[PDB]
Design a protein around this ligand. Structure first.
Ligand SMILES: CCCCCCCCCCCCCCCC(=O)O
Ligand SMILES: CCCCCCCCCCCCCCCC(=O)O
Ligand SMILES: [Zn+2]
Ligand SMILES: [Zn+2]
Lengths: 207, 348, 348, 210
């Protein structure tokens, strides 16, 4: 598929730019640069994640099934990939040691966000399970209205893939609003190094 | 016999004839005027042996010129339509009103000239196409009608009966009997009927005891001088005082058989009675109405022709001119012109 | 109407049909055997709507394959000749001697297989051609003859009556009633009629309260095993002793509907009486004669089969073999081979 | 990946040969060919499935993750995959109506095979779930820490390939025992039904991918 080839080259360049932005934010954190330039770099990282979601939405239109399999990510990320990406609550647990010290308000906001994210995760996962079971059953019946059901199911799957990404982007922005510039920068650095370490581990599992 | 199945067959083939292009027509009969009738080769090859032999010879995109295979009697279009409709559906189809009807609203169109002409044409078509049932049907119609037809049309009927060979023996015999019974002049017969026919008619008139007067020598000279355009020879013959135009019916001859200008000159000489009556019993106005020439009628009325005179059967020139013109012409327009001239003159 | 001209038209069209090449034939109808009939496009485009549509679609030397337009029933040649003769002359041409007559010389050939088959073929042709009068006439014929024809042939008549849809409603209804009032086996209904007809007949049979017993599951298992040509499975089932070939009538099934080799291998086991009857009263040899398969009859005669036994209607194997074959074959030669085999076995 | 490209070409050729063998067995059944040739065709369908399993084992050594991902199969087939292939109990249910009629003994044998296949599937599923949870936990360690990681990676890869090998073994065992319970004709009908099932699934994938 030409669309998937275009996605894979765009994704290679996205990974390269992610690595560049992580190196830049590392340098900014280590040089103790002022809030304004650091906030600009934070916002650049946020824009880059937004661009990730845009390319993911474009790729989902070409072949939603190939995106649900996760063959486009690294070998180690597949163990954590949930419907075409990572689980936000787990990344929150990942970043928790680096954001301290938190005020009472930040702690309340983070715990509320985690509870709401968990509830949304459970409800969306249940909806996907029901959708998946209904396609299994309907294909089984048909092989052993059909076009309309096929189209409906495809649209539903697309909506779920764009909804989970909507939730991920909303929670990411919520962290970008809860945290100070320095905290947000440290969290983005941690995220980038985490992803790089997973890719390195995948390379070790493939060597 | 099963009548319903035959009726459905006839209806199907009549519907075929009524829309020939819709049922794969493969032949076209073109007439003398230029009109075309689309017909199928199988139907006419079956019903007509003449059409079978003609299509078998033409096939040695199929067109048959009716003016060539007939070539003995000019046939109209409605008569061809009637003959083909009878060939296809085995039933006679009446022509559109106006073809077999005259311009006289009092005429029943049983013996008038248009009806007789249509019957003659259809009978000749049936003879040429070798259809014995239609030949007998219209031969019986003509036999039932000749007794009420004017003798000048009986001449044409007898002509057709002679042309149609031995297939119209009854019609030919009846026409010969009617002609020899009446007092028709020899002039017209010789100038219309063929030589052998007039000779046979004269022989039968002589042998049957009926009187056959000798053709007057000077009258024959006058008639021959009239047929050859030579006005000086006519003046020379008249200067001998041995001839008279009224005694020879020279006006009748010039109006019936001669050119328009010859009759105009003979009238301008003012040497003959315009209201003179021929041995047959007709005036010059009646002969002019039969001839259908407007110049002769205008010159006759301008010279003092009385229009109130009637023939032996009681017809005046107006009724003759009506019964001589086709009805479609008052709905070649030379007939309509004469009709309108006579109607305009009658209004004054 | 004038009947004489109609009869001349009919005679001319009969002469056209008798020699279509002499009357510009422009289309051809090719049968399933290889034979061909010449016909005209106009006549059949007028008499039948089906041919009008087919020729108008083909036009968008013309050949029409009967196996493509009428594909669900193999019609003979004499049926096509009769239908086309009615198309051309509206006259029902009788069939040639031998076609409507069987091999038996003790029959009047009034309700035998060859005759009913010819009638069915002509009725199907009239239905395809949408000629309603021919349809009605032969539907009448079939209702007159059906009350004497053996049930087995009434099944085929019902099959074609349903093929003719709502046009042959009367024949269909009659056939249905006849079949319902008869003790036809369930397997025969399943193997002779579509699912719709079987379900309809069962519903009507069950609504009147007639004896309609269900089929034993193990008997259905042996029958399905025989239908798949799996003799070893039937062997294992008989090893289980759940079924018996006598209570299942496996010989009758194998001879009637299954393959020849399966019935041969089933006979080669020798585990069932060959002269055993069925609820309908037929032995294995009688069904073998009804099927006209020589190898089955031969293998039955080589193993032991009484040929002097009759059915409930009084027909012997020789009578069935004679009445199942047409008289053309004794004056596919499979029926002739069976009849000669059985006549040899007679004097033996 | 040269190995994965080789696997995909072998699978393409396998599909072509499957279509060819299904057409041949359909034609043979319709022609009422004798038991010997039909049994040869059955044993060649079985050999072809065995060849599929060998090639799947070869793919499992090169990239076990690729086999579990199912992206080498068509979209609708992925809805039914289990440890790198189809679930034998479901294919048995799919083909059972077509190997009909079954004898009482054959019926008992097939239901016993179905029960044993179901129990093996459940045990393999539980083992795979436990392995995957252990993989989550063990992976969560190397990333936090800056001898043991490589050995654990290799042992876990061996465990995943072993699970794929056991699932392929279960499919092959179920196939061969169905081929031994049934007669040649009955087995041929079942293989024809299975082949048409797979072809219909692939056709539906092509129709949904238009
Ligand atoms: C500035 C935010 C600091 C706190 C970050 C907590 C974790 C954010 C989770 C969003 C990560 C987005 C990356 C998704 C990658 C993918 O879809 O493959
Ligand atoms: C004689 C066999 C008749 C049919 C038996 C069908 C039930 C066996 C199920 C195993 C089929 C193996 C084919 C799947 C191959 C694969 O998943 O790659
Ligand atoms: Zn008139
Ligand atoms: Zn008979």
């Amino acid at each position: 598929n030409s669309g998937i080839a275009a996605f894979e080259m765009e994704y290679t360049h996205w990974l390269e730019e992610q690595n560049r932005r992580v190196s830049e934010i590392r340098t900014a954190l280590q040089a103790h640069i002022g809030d304004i330039e650091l906030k600009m770099l934070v916002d650049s990282c946020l824009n880059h994640y937004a661009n990730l979601f845009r390319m993911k939405a474009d790729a989902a239109k070409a072949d939603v099934f190939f995106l649900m399999s996760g063959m486009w990510r690294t070998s180690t990320e597949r163990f954590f990939q949930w419907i075409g990406g990572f689980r936000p609550s787990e990344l929150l647990n990942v970043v928790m040691p680096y954001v301290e010290p938190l005020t009472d308000q930040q702690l309340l906001e983070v715990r509320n966000l985690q509870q709401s994210s968990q509830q949304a995760e459970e409800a969306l996962s249940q909806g996907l399970d029901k959708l998946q079971q209904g396609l299994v059953e309907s294909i089984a019946i048909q092989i052993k209205a059909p076009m309309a059901s096929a189209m409906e199911n495809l649209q539903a799957l697309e909506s779920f893939v764009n909804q989970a990404d909507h939730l991920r982007q909303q929670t990411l922005q919520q962290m970008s609003k809860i945290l100070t510039t320095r905290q947000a920068a440290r969290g983005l650095l941690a995220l980038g190094e985490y992803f790089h370490r997973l890719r390195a581990l995948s390379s070790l599992w493939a060597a | 016999p099963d009548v319903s199945a035959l009726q459905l067959l006839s209806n199907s083939f009549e519907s075929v004839f009524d829309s020939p292009d819709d049922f794969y027509s493969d032949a076209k009969l073109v007439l003398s005027d230029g009109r075309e009738v689309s017909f199928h080769r199988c139907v006419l090859s079956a019903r007509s042996s003449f059409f079978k032999s003609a299509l078998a010879a033409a096939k040695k995109a199929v067109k048959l010129e009716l003016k060539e295979i007939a070539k003995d009697y000019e046939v109209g279009f409605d008569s061809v339509v009637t003959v083909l409709a009878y060939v296809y559906s085995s039933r006679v189809r009446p022509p559109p009103k106006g073809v077999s009807e005259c311009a006289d609203e009092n005429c029943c169109h049983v013996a008038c000239r248009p009806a007789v002409d249509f019957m003659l044409e259809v009978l000749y078509l049936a003879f040429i196409f070798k259809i014995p049932e239609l030949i007998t049907l219209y031969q019986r119609h003509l036999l039932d009608v000749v007794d009420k037809v004017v003798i000048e049309d009986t001449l044409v009927i007898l002509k057709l009966a002679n042309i149609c060979g031995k297939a119209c023996m009854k019609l030919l015999d009846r026409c010969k009997e009617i002609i020899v019974k009446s007092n028709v002049d020899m002039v017209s017969l010789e100038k219309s009927l063929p030589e052998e026919l007039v000779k046979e008619i004269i022989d039968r008139r002589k042998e049957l005891g009926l009187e056959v007067p000798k053709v007057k020598k000077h009258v024959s000279n006058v008639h021959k001088a009239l047929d050859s355009d030579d006005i000086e020879l006519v003046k020379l013959l008249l200067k001998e005082d041995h001839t008279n135009l009224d005694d020879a019916c020279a006006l009748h001859f010039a109006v019936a058989y001669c050119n328009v200008k010859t009759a105009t000159d003979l009238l301008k000489l003012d040497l003959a009675d315009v209201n003179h009556r021929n041995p047959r019993g007709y005036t010059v106005l009646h002969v002019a109405a039969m001839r259908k020439e407007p110049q002769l009628i205008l010159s006759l009325l301008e010279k003092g022709a009385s229009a109130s005179e009637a023939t032996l059967e009681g017809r005046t020139a107006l009724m003759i001119a009506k019964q001589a013109t086709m009805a479609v012409e008052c709905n070649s327009l030379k007939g309509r012109l004469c009709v309108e001239i006579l109607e305009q003159e009658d209004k004054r």
